Design an enzyme around this catalytic site. Sequence first.
Site, PDB file in Angstrom:
ATOM      1  N   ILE A  21       0.860  -1.201   0.000  1.00 61.31           N
ATOM      2  CA  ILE A  21       0.000   0.000   0.000  1.00 61.31           C
ATOM      3  C   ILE A  21       0.887   1.239   0.000  1.00 61.31           C
ATOM      4  O   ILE A  21       0.682   2.143  -0.816  1.00 61.31           O
ATOM      5  CB  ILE A  21      -0.973   0.056   1.214  1.00 61.31           C
ATOM      6  N   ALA A  26       7.813   7.468   7.383  1.00 61.62           N
ATOM      7  CA  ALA A  26       8.724   7.478   8.546  1.00 61.62           C
ATOM      8  C   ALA A  26       8.306   6.450   9.602  1.00 61.62           C
ATOM      9  O   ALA A  26       9.156   5.861  10.254  1.00 61.62           O
ATOM     10  CB  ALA A  26       8.734   8.873   9.169  1.00 61.62           C
ATOM     11  N   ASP A  81      -2.945  16.323  15.303  1.00 62.51           N
ATOM     12  CA  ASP A  81      -2.424  16.323  13.942  1.00 62.51           C
ATOM     13  C   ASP A  81      -3.504  16.014  12.936  1.00 62.51           C
ATOM     14  O   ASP A  81      -3.334  15.186  12.029  1.00 62.51           O
ATOM     15  CB  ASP A  81      -1.255  15.367  13.817  1.00 62.51           C
TER      16      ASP A  81
HETATM   17  C1  LIG Z   1       5.977   9.144  12.451  1.00 59.87           C
HETATM   18  O1  LIG Z   1       6.751   8.221  13.222  1.00 59.87           O
HETATM   19  C2  LIG Z   1       6.119   7.125  13.756  1.00 59.87           C
HETATM   20  C3  LIG Z   1       6.911   6.199  14.410  1.00 59.87           C
HETATM   21  C4  LIG Z   1       6.348   5.072  14.968  1.00 59.87           C
HETATM   22  C5  LIG Z   1       4.979   4.880  14.899  1.00 59.87           C
HETATM   23  C6  LIG Z   1       4.163   5.792  14.239  1.00 59.87           C
HETATM   24  C7  LIG Z   1       2.658   5.569  14.178  1.00 59.87           C
HETATM   25  C8  LIG Z   1       1.973   6.093  15.437  1.00 59.87           C
HETATM   26  N1  LIG Z   1       2.049   6.194  13.010  1.00 59.87           N
HETATM   27  C9  LIG Z   1       1.209   5.581  12.180  1.00 59.87           C
HETATM   28  O2  LIG Z   1       0.966   4.380  12.223  1.00 59.87           O
HETATM   29  C10 LIG Z   1       0.551   6.480  11.155  1.00 59.87           C
HETATM   30  N2  LIG Z   1      -0.164   5.735  10.137  1.00 59.87           N
HETATM   31  C11 LIG Z   1       0.481   5.266   8.917  1.00 59.87           C
HETATM   32  C12 LIG Z   1      -0.663   4.608   8.201  1.00 59.87           C
HETATM   33  C13 LIG Z   1      -0.699   3.962   6.987  1.00 59.87           C
HETATM   34  C14 LIG Z   1      -1.883   3.440   6.508  1.00 59.87           C
HETATM   35  C15 LIG Z   1      -3.068   3.578   7.226  1.00 59.87           C
HETATM   36  C16 LIG Z   1      -4.313   2.954   6.704  1.00 59.87           C
HETATM   37  N3  LIG Z   1      -4.532   3.070   5.389  1.00 59.87           N
HETATM   38  C17 LIG Z   1      -5.637   2.472   4.878  1.00 59.87           C
HETATM   39  N4  LIG Z   1      -5.888   2.601   3.561  1.00 59.87           N
HETATM   40  C18 LIG Z   1      -5.111   3.386   2.622  1.00 59.87           C
HETATM   41  C19 LIG Z   1      -5.235   2.821   1.209  1.00 59.87           C
HETATM   42  C20 LIG Z   1      -4.583   3.741   0.191  1.00 59.87           C
HETATM   43  O3  LIG Z   1      -5.126   5.074   0.259  1.00 59.87           O
HETATM   44  C21 LIG Z   1      -4.867   5.650   1.552  1.00 59.87           C
HETATM   45  C22 LIG Z   1      -5.556   4.850   2.649  1.00 59.87           C
HETATM   46  N5  LIG Z   1      -6.525   1.739   5.579  1.00 59.87           N
HETATM   47  C23 LIG Z   1      -6.279   1.597   6.886  1.00 59.87           C
HETATM   48  C24 LIG Z   1      -5.180   2.184   7.482  1.00 59.87           C
HETATM   49 CL1  LIG Z   1      -4.901   1.953   9.180  1.00 59.87          CL
HETATM   50  C25 LIG Z   1      -3.018   4.221   8.473  1.00 59.87           C
HETATM   51  C26 LIG Z   1      -1.826   4.735   8.941  1.00 59.87           C
HETATM   52  C27 LIG Z   1      -1.504   5.471  10.184  1.00 59.87           C
HETATM   53  O4  LIG Z   1      -2.251   5.802  11.097  1.00 59.87           O
HETATM   54  C28 LIG Z   1       4.749   6.923  13.677  1.00 59.87           C
END
Ligand SMILES: COc1cccc([C@@H](C)NC(=O)CN2Cc3ccc(-c4nc(NC5CCOCC5)ncc4Cl)cc3C2=O)c1
Length: 345
Positions: A21, A25, A139
């Site tokens: 996907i 970072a 954020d």
């Molecule tokens: C910045 O330093 C750090 C260090 C360590 C940990 C973290 C932690 C807390 N940070 C995250 O985890 C942030 N992130 C990344 C992330 C990536 C994809 C998703 C997602 N994406 C889709 N679908 C996509 C499909 C294509 O189009 C866009 C949406 N579905 C369901 C989900 Cl959970 C959600 C997230 C999310 O919250 C940050």
Amino acid sequence: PEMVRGQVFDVGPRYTNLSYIGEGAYGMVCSAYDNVNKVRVAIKKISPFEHQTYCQRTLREIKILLRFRHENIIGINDIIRAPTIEQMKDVYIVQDLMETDLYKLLKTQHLSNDHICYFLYQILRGLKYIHSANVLHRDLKPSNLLLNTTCDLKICDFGLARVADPDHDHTGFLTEYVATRWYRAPEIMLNSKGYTKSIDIWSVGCILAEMLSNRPIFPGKHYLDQLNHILGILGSPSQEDLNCIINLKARNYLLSLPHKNKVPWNRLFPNADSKALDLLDKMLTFNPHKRIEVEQALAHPYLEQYYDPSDEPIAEAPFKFDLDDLPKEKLKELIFEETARFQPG
Ligand SMILES: COc1cccc([C@@H](C)NC(=O)CN2Cc3ccc(-c4nc(NC5CCOCC5)ncc4Cl)cc3C2=O)c1
């Protein structure tokens, strides 16, 4: 062990048929087939243990999202990690897979007024719950608003979230801040640490404006330029709002600027619904004490077709952690404890 883009994904036996996907970072994200629930899911691989700040973001995210339960808030379904602390180098967080996000949708799609109304309602309904738990997201932005194919919306990414702390909100002028520049309230640049609920309302206001035009309303290119853009539209603050800024560096900076007139919302957003522009104005109020609150925003005439306080739930209890001084080795321990419920038994 499945691999994706030069990266092991040790998520089996339960999760198979991985498709890339994205990455960032935070680490890497794939979709996978969940062989228990028979759905594809999102799985993000976090490898945070060499950096205290990544451990912090990971722990906040996990602790908050496992406590919260709300239709407009992404959940955690499962967490995969090694059976011992010693063997634990990665954490896989399993979440409902969503089609897209509001950043992506705004780059490609005109939103009808009915879509804008429904998205904003959902954002505020989720935020009511978050704020009812005495938590600040800190954020909020289009890429943190996930969408499915029927436009159901879910707030994600709680790695910068905090318990609200209004009595410790004050700071000096030009204090450094971490959250995304374009969605930062003017007070961040002036005298606020972003420890009050009003910081999130500002961000929602910016999202609302971006929904109306598909362009960020205050696209600042660096820390103080963000205030330049804000004042460029809101105009010079009133004497009364200036008097609430007691810090002399911040006040004198504002007093040093030439007088700027307010740009009317209906000139920036000629095709917008007038009620949407009224709510926008209340969310993008310079003075955070005068800024509308989440529950008032929900009660605003723009959202009348959706507003139903009996169907806008709140958290059972205010959220509290058991800290920002903790070493990455202690945070690993807490991540280990917090993820234990997902192990066999
Ligand atoms: C910045 O330093 C750090 C260090 C360590 C940990 C973290 C932690 C807390 N940070 C995250 O985890 C942030 N992130 C990344 C992330 C990536 C994809 C998703 C997602 N994406 C889709 N679908 C996509 C499909 C294509 O189009 C866009 C949406 N579905 C369901 C989900 Cl959970 C959600 C997230 C999310 O919250 C940050």
